[PDB]
RNA sequence: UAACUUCGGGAGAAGGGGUGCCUGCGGGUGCGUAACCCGCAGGUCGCAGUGACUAGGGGGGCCCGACUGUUUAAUAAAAA
RNA sequence: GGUCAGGUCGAGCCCGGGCUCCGUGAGGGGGGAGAAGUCGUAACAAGGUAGCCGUAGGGGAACCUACGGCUCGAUC
RNA sequence: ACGGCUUUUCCGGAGUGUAAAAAGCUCCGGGAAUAAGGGCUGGGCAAGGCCGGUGGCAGCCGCCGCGGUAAUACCGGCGGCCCGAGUGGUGGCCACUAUUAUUGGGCCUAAAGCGGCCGUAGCCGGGCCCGUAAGUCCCUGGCGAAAUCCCACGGCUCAACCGUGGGGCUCGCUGGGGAUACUGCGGGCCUUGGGACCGGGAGAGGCCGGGGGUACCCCCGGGGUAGGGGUGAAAUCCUAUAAUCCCGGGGGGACCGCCAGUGGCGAAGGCGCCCGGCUGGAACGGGUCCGACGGUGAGGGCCGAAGGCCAGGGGAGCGAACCGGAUUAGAUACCCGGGUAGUCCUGGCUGUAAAGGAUGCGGGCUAGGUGUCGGGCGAGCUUCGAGCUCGCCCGGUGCCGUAGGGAAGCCGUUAAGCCCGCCGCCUGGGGAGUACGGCCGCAAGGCUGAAACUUAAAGGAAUUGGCGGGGGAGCACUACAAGGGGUGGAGCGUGCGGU
RNA sequence: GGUGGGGUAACGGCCCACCAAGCCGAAGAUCGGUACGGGCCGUGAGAGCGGGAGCCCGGAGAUGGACACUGAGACACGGGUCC
């Protein structure tokens, strides 16, 4: 309700100020000055990190959808951490055994949260026994023992 | 309070010219508004002005032709150079050398193709197109 | 408290007034607990 | 719009544009000293003398005089004043506010519960001071003036 | 010089350094080179200088009674 | 270069007090997701007692009542 | 499929290359001989409405969405579309985003104007004249290494790469000369903005003091007998110790009925009996006075409904809490009968409201028309009234409305239009005005104020329909009103549910 | 900050003796977090935003610290002493 200020020559100080003030109302830059996504990272700002599979589980589908959703536990070999790995394919679950390490590498939600039906969930396995969950699903390879 | 005599005569121009007046009168008047009106009237956006003595800082009656679509001042007075005038001219004007800018130059007031052509710089007052 | 017009609206969701009440309540009781009075 | 209220009240003086005094006033520059000598010494403030010139004897205004020892002057009341000697210590309506803010602080301090009146005070003063600040930076006050209520009894007295 | 607090306290909380003798100066009140008190610099001795005498050990939780006070003279001083 | 004295820079160890954090702790408090549970029906129509804000007091729960205020109130 | 042709590449050799090797380069022999994968196929987004399998499972899905026995969306086969020695997946930065807005965003109803004023630094500031060149502009010396960036030519086959020249970059610093329009600084002269003063008027503006107005409650006396009150209906309650009601007196505490009006005065909150005293502000008419003294204002100060708290008074009527009577399946309520705090005065604290015009404040400009309040001017009436009617100017206060603005509702000289200023606030919905910390308060509480995590919407205006224990017009014996005969009670025929 | 000195290759509270109360700060002191600085690099039509390991210049370090000898140059990565 009024020309905007300041606008005078000489207000360069105080343009500076609002302007750096009135920044801080944007959660991007507030998150990434203050390291706010570091504080909490699990995987400590990595793309992908190795763990091992504590116990396997199925997660209900969202409404209106429904089904069983396939994850695995992992330990994060990093810091111990355990989080919650979604195992992407038709029959990716058989392949996944008990005290297996597993590369999870993160899912590419909105923001970098859970994506689809499954919240909660925020990585998928990709690797298995250094072997690709993608060619063990397909049957290209054959899953190693470990 | 009053501030900026010139940007007052300029709103009033332009406000005068879309609602289709044909004659206006800017109150107070001054000597840069006396330059800035004899500039446009050089270039012919503006008829006949003329100055009018009433006890106080004087009265400008202006007869208007139709031919302005945008006049207003430039606040704050940027100093600009002669290699300069290209950004300034992109800012307030619609295409290249449609309109003109009034610059206040050490030699005086005038436009900025005037200025340009005498090879000086000086700050920006005004633009009318 | 602050001013939050947006949520005396009605549309799901109770009355802002008993909300305020309510969260005055947890208060009292969480400074009674930590020993503050 | 006003200081405080906020209004736009127009009311004033409509004075004709004039660069010479009228040729049907019949006293002239000395008589018209005189007269404000006279007046001042009636006990009248400068415009209350001005207010008789123009009334009574029939004088526009002395502005319109031009100065007879100062080629680049016109006359003023004040100036006349001040070279007969009899111009105001400090100004006039500094003096006038400060009169009135000290008359409401005696009554206040009878009336305690009149807050309205208080708030008339408090803009009272705050007129004062912008005055001061004024007559401070034009050098018209000491440098050292300030502007306190129990110092302004011997002021107004 | 802490938690806590009734903002008064807790508190000398806790904790740390110094302390003799000799030589000579400075300061306060004072007329005073009378009397009392407070500092400064240097030298020096012992294991130890408030050298004897005089002269608190301290801190953190819980129960009860708010406090000072009174009581079974002659087994109970307390939460009574 | 040994030995005895001072004078300095000074690592390491110990004690006390500040600051930046990090891990956990039986047990309590609200918050969010949960799908087809129990109690009542508070709001949306004048929602069946118009709704709502501020303060205050009560009630298993939505909620109820008192004073001041708004219409983001239907009929008249 | 047939008949041909080269050899970039591959294979085997000779020189040249290299410190010596290797690669590269030139040449000979053989021969198409040695060489294509990755994602996708519902939209966004180019690509199939084909077939086989699963059937709310398995699965897919950045988002919207698909899958329930006829799946173009899951898996597979066959087709196809994109790039191609590359093509997918995840994290990070920029653009996207005018969702950080100097250029260049918003704050009536969607996020957002401090509840309201005074004012300090800061920022922004009326007209003219002279002086200085600090800011500003022009010219000229010393600089801001190279590489990197752009262009032209030249050398490795062209290119990448390198060389020779020109320019740019290092957001600038500094030695001098010139200019004076604007800003800054010093001086002079002004009145337009803002103040001061005078005149006649307007107003529930505020404080103090004194007189009243009915109404209501209680007490006394007289009259008069049986009910009174209250509700949809009742009941609790009052009443024989004489109630409700009428009349003659006494006492008390709140509040100023009609007139009263999108009327008036205040920064806001708020302010209606009369008279006297004190006192604040504004409008009008001013050839009156000062001479830019101005606007907004971070911190800070003052005022501030109701309610609540501390101390002392008062307490008629209402009335949180509470007790009792009703209604209801229940009724901790709505209804009724009582009633403490409070509502009232004095000295203080609290500083909160849908404190709303959901719209900060100063200035200039942009058609009008029509009410009303105050002042002034002109004209006409007059019972000569401080009276009436009409017109004009200024300042307040309403409605309609043009240009224009907006998502629209609507605003529209009292802008939510265009322009010149200043402060405050907002950056998707929750978590949350919460947790921790700090300040103020006797307390209740007040101010400041996040994260983890969760979510694809939340929110606004308006349209069609449907509904309302909303308002109106109508219609109907599968509605009623007025009537005639019946079913439901018994046996049986028949058709259902169940067994 | 000063008056007088010492020391240094040099000026200097760098240090010492004496004399005063100064110095910094809402135009963000002090404290805390992060970080080698620049030429440059990424992106965008531009304003701008983000990064600043590789090459060049400048600065620091040689397991964490503290000391010294020799030399024009070190309190010295492939010399020395102690913890």
């Not at chain 1, 699990?42 to 209106?64: C, D, N, S, T, Y």
Request: aromatic share 8%; proline share 6%.
């Amino acid at each position: 309700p009024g020309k905007k200020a300041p606008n005078g020559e000489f207000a360069g100080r105080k343009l500076k100020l609002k302007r750096k003030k009135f920044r801080w109302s944007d959660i991007r830059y507030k998150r990434r000055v203050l390291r706010l996504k570091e504080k909490s990272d699990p995987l400590e700002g990595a793309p992908q990190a190795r763990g091992i599979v504590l116990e396997k589980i199925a997660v209900e589908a969202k409404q209106p959808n429904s089904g069983m959703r396939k994850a695995v536990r992992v330990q994060l070999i990093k810091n111990g951490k355990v989080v919650t790995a979604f195992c992407p394919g038709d029959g990716a679950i058989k392949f996944i055994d008990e005290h297996d390490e597993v590369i999870i590498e993160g899912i590419g939600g909105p923001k970098g949260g859970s994506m689809g039906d499954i919240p909660g969930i925020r990585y998928k396995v990709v690797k298995v026994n250094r072997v690709s969950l993608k060619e063990l699903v397909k049957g290209r390879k054959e899953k190693p023992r470990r | 309070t009053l501030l900026d005599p010139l940007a007052n005569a300029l709103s009033h121009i332009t406000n005068s010219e879309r609602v289709g007046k044909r004659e206006v009168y800017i109150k107070p008047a001054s000597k840069l508004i006396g330059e800035v009106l004899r500039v446009m009237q050089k270039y012919g956006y503006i008829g006949e002005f003329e100055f009018i003595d009433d006890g106080r800082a004087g009265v400008y009656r202006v007869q208007l032709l139709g031919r302005i679509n945008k006049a207003g001042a430039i606040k704050p007075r940027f100093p600009v150079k002669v290699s300069e005038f290209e950004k300034w001219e992109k800012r307030f004007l619609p295409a290249f050398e449609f309109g003109i800018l009034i610059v206040s130059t050490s030699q005086g007031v005038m436009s900025h193709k005037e200025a340009i052509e005498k090879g000086i710089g000086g700050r920006l007052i005004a633009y009318v197109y | 408290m602050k001013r939050r017009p947006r949520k005396w609206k009605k549309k799901g969701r109770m009355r802002w007034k008993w909300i305020k009440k309510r969260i005055r309540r947890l208060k009292r009781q969480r400074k009674k607990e930590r020993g503050l009075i | 719009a006003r200081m405080h209220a906020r209004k736009r009240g127009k009311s004033g003086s409509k004075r004709p544009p004039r660069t010479a005094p009228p040729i049907w006033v019949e006293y002239t520059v000395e008589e018209i000293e005189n007269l404000v000598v006279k007046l001042r010494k009636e006990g009248y403030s400068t415009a209350m003398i001005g207010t008789i010139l123009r009334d009574q004897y029939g004088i526009p205004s002395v502005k319109l005089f031009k100065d007879p020892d100062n080629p680049n002057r016109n006359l003023t009341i004040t100036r006349i004043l001040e070279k007969h000697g009899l111009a105001p210590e400090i100004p006039e309506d500094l003096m006038f506010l400060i009169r009135r803010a000290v008359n409401l602080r005696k009554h206040l301090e009878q009336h305690p519960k009149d807050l309205h009146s208080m708030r008339g005070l408090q803009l009272i003063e705050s007129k004062i001071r912008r005055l001061v600040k004024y007559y401070k930076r034009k050098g018209k006050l000491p440098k050292n003036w300030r502007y306190d209520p129990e110092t302004a009894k011997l002021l107004v007295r």
